[PDB]
Amino acid sequence: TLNLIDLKLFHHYCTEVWPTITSAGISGERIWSDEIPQLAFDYPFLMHALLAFSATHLARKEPGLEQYVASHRLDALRLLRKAVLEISEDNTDALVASALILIMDSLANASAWIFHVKGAATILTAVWPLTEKSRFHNLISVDLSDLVCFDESIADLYPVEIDSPYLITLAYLDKLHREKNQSDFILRVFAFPALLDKTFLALLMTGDLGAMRIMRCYYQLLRGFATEVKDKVWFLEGITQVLPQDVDDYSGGGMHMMLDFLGGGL
Amino acid sequence: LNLIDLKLFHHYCTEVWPTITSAGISGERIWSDEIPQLAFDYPFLMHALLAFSATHLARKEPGLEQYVASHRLDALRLLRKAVLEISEDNTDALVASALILIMDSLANASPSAWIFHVKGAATILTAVWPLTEKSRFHNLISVDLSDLGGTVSELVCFDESIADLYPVEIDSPYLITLAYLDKLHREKNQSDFILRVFAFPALLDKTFLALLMTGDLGAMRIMRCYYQLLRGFATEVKDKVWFLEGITQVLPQDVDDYSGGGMHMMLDFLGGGLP
Ligand SMILES: CC(C)[C@@H](C)/C=C/[C@@H](C)[C@H]1CC[C@H]2C3=CC=C4C[C@@H](O)CC[C@]4(C)[C@H]3CC[C@]12C
Numbered sequence: 001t002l003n004l005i006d007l008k009l010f011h012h013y014c015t016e017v018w019p020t021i022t023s024a025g026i027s028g029e030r031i032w033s034d035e036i037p038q039l040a041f042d043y044p045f046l047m048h049a050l051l052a053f054s055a056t057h058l059a060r061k062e063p064g065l066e067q068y069v070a071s072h073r074l075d076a077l078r079l080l081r082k083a084v085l086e087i088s089e090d091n092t093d094a095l096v097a098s099a100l101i102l103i104m105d106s107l108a109n110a111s112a113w114i115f116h117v118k119g120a121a122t123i124l125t126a127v128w129p130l131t132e133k134s135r136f137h138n139l140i141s142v143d144l145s146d147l148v149c150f151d152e153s154i155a156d157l158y159p160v161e162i163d164s165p166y167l168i169t170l171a172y173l174d175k176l177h178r179e180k181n182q183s184d185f186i187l188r189v190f191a192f193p194a195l196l197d198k199t200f201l202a203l204l205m206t207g208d209l210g211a212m213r214i215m216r217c218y219y220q221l222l223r224g225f226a227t228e229v230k231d232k233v234w235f236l237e238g239i240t241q242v243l244p245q246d247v248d249d250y251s252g253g254g255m256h257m258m259l260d261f262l263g264g265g266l
Numbered sequence: 267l268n269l270i271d272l273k274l275f276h277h278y279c280t281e282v283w284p285t286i287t288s289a290g291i292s293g294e295r296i297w298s299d300e301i302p303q304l305a306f307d308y309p310f311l312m313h314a315l316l317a318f319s320a321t322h323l324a325r326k327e328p329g330l331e332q333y334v335a336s337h338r339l340d341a342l343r344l345l346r347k348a349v350l351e352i353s354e355d356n357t358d359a360l361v362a363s364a365l366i367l368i369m370d371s372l373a374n375a376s377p378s379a380w381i382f383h384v385k386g387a388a389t390i391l392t393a394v395w396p397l398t399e400k401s402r403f404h405n406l407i408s409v410d411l412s413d414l415g416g417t418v419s420e421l422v423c424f425d426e427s428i429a430d431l432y433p434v435e436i437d438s439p440y441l442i443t444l445a446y447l448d449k450l451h452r453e454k455n456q457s458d459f460i461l462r463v464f465a466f467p468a469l470l471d472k473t474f475l476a477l478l479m480t481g482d483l484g485a486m487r488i489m490r491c492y493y494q495l496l497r498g499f500a501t502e503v504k505d506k507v508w509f510l511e512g513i514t515q516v517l518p519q520d521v522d523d524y525s526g527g528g529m530h531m532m533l534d535f536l537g538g539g540l541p
């Protein structure tokens with residue numbers, strides 16, 4: 001029929017939106033610049049996810065368009081969770097990029113945002129780990145090949161001994177704070193709860209005290225970081241209205257906040 | 267969700283505009299961003315844009331030449347209509363679609379229908395001329411704003427002479443075209459020369475062009491000089507500029523070897539006896 005709307009939205013992505021991604025701290029410029037756009041021609045679910053994020057960013061200076069954010073994301077999730085079942089090595093990078101786009105898109109609106117966030121972040125978990133052939137490998141995770149939270153110290157947790165179910169997560173979280181300033185920190189701290197190891201995660205959803213103390217320290221880092229770049233990164237603006245400072249101020253309290261971002265399932 | 271037009275349009279903003287800039291055309295933000303943003307408001311330009319880009323992506327992928335045709339004719343049909351409501355809002359969109367359609371017709375030349383298409387496309391330039399200097403596109407013309415001076419300048423054609431047309435009078439119906447043709451030779455190497463040289467027969471003053479359509483031999487010798495200018499520049503960039511490849515196997519060297527002789531070649535390329 002000829003569609004100038006998606007044409008406008010896609011042109012907007014390769015002109016105005018991808019630099020939006022790179023100046024928030026993400027690296028791999030040609031990832032966002034050209035590799036993701038051509039990936040979208042082979043995988044519809046990525047194209048819809050690109051298009052929706054694009055409309056979301058443009059709808060800041062044009063009305064209309066908010067019915068185009070809704071169409072493209074529903075279509076993106078529909079095709080995602082079946083693409084999510086035949087996960088392949090030809091379509092994992094397309095699946096990670098869609099999840100990252102969907103995360104930034106959901107983050108830019110402020111119960112539904114949580115529901116898309118959680119769904120989007122389930123794609124990261126189902127693809128984890130990535131071969132290091134993936135364009136996306138060092139942008140979402142941290143180097144774990146080697147050997148504190150002022151408000152709620154997790155010091156009565158070290159020493160960590162080798163068979164602790166906290167070892168991996170404490171290491172991960174420790175490495176995550178010291179690249180607080182290296183490239184791709186946005187993606188790594190967003191991707192963290194989605195890449196927890198299976199045993200820690202099982203411990204968490206039972207309410208293990210130690211696992212929750214560790215996650216609340218993570219939360220200070222994530223909210224701290226968001227508090228500090230909200231000014232700069234358009235798709236994080238006003239996320240700290242959504243994320244309360246006392247996570248016990250969520251409405252079931254901190255434990256239902258934990259459950260609503262980690263629970264559910266098919 | 268139509269990913270062919272999305273692939274075609276991404277192909278324009280990444281691979282094809284660099285190819286316009288690189289042939290000698292100026293105003294890189296006109297082609298890289300200003301023309302795409304115009305395409306969203308005027309369907310006829312989008313079609314011309316995607317047709318030209320399919321044309322270009324058809325050099326390395328099969329298929330696609332079903333989509334060159336589709337978009338071209340939908341461009342031509344919408345333009346037909348848009349060129350009647352010619353406005354300040356849509357002059358630049360008209361101009362860019364013509365120039366796109368001209369490069370596209372010239373790339374598919376490699377009446378045998380490109381002529382008809384160039385002719386039709388070039389009608390849009392005529393219908394829009396002259397341009398306010400508000401137009402992004404005041405780069406299809408020379409400036410005839412200066413003058414000459416103790417008398418200064420006389421154009422000289424080599425294979426045939428327009429030497430006996432001198433010195434030209436003020437009331438001469440050759441003055442405007444001869445000055446335009448001399449300045450055109452003088453910016454043979456400045457930017458946007460290919461657009462200027464292509465636009466030239468579309469921007470002739472109506473008096474000179476009625477003289478042409480009646481067979482004035484003076485007007486015809488001048489245009490024979492322009493042809494040497496255009497065929498000479500074309501045969502010498504045709505292997506660097508992709509949409510001009512093979513153009514010399516379609517524009518003969520001796521214009522008397524066209525189908526009905528040079529007289530017919532002239533008139534199959536123009537459009538309508540001026541009042
Ligand atoms: C926004 C994207 C990056 C997604 C992935 C992150 C959401 C954050 C806000 C979610 C992910 C895990 C959630 C989380 C896990 C565990 C608990 C322990 C509980 O005792 C208090 C709530 C708490 C601490 C919650 C708070 C909200 C968290 C930290």
Ligand SMILES: CC(C)[C@@H](C)/C=C/[C@@H](C)[C@H]1CC[C@H]2C3=CC=C4C[C@@H](O)CC[C@]4(C)[C@H]3CC[C@]12C
Nearest residue numbers: 384388464467486489490493521528531532535
């Ligand atoms: C390809 C686009 C740019 C269109 C506009 C240009 C077509 C060219 C090839 C056409 C335009 C005017 C034509 C033209 C006009 C007048 C004459 C005089 C005649 O005694 C010989 C043929 C000749 C010289 C022809 C040759 C072909 C010309 C030069």
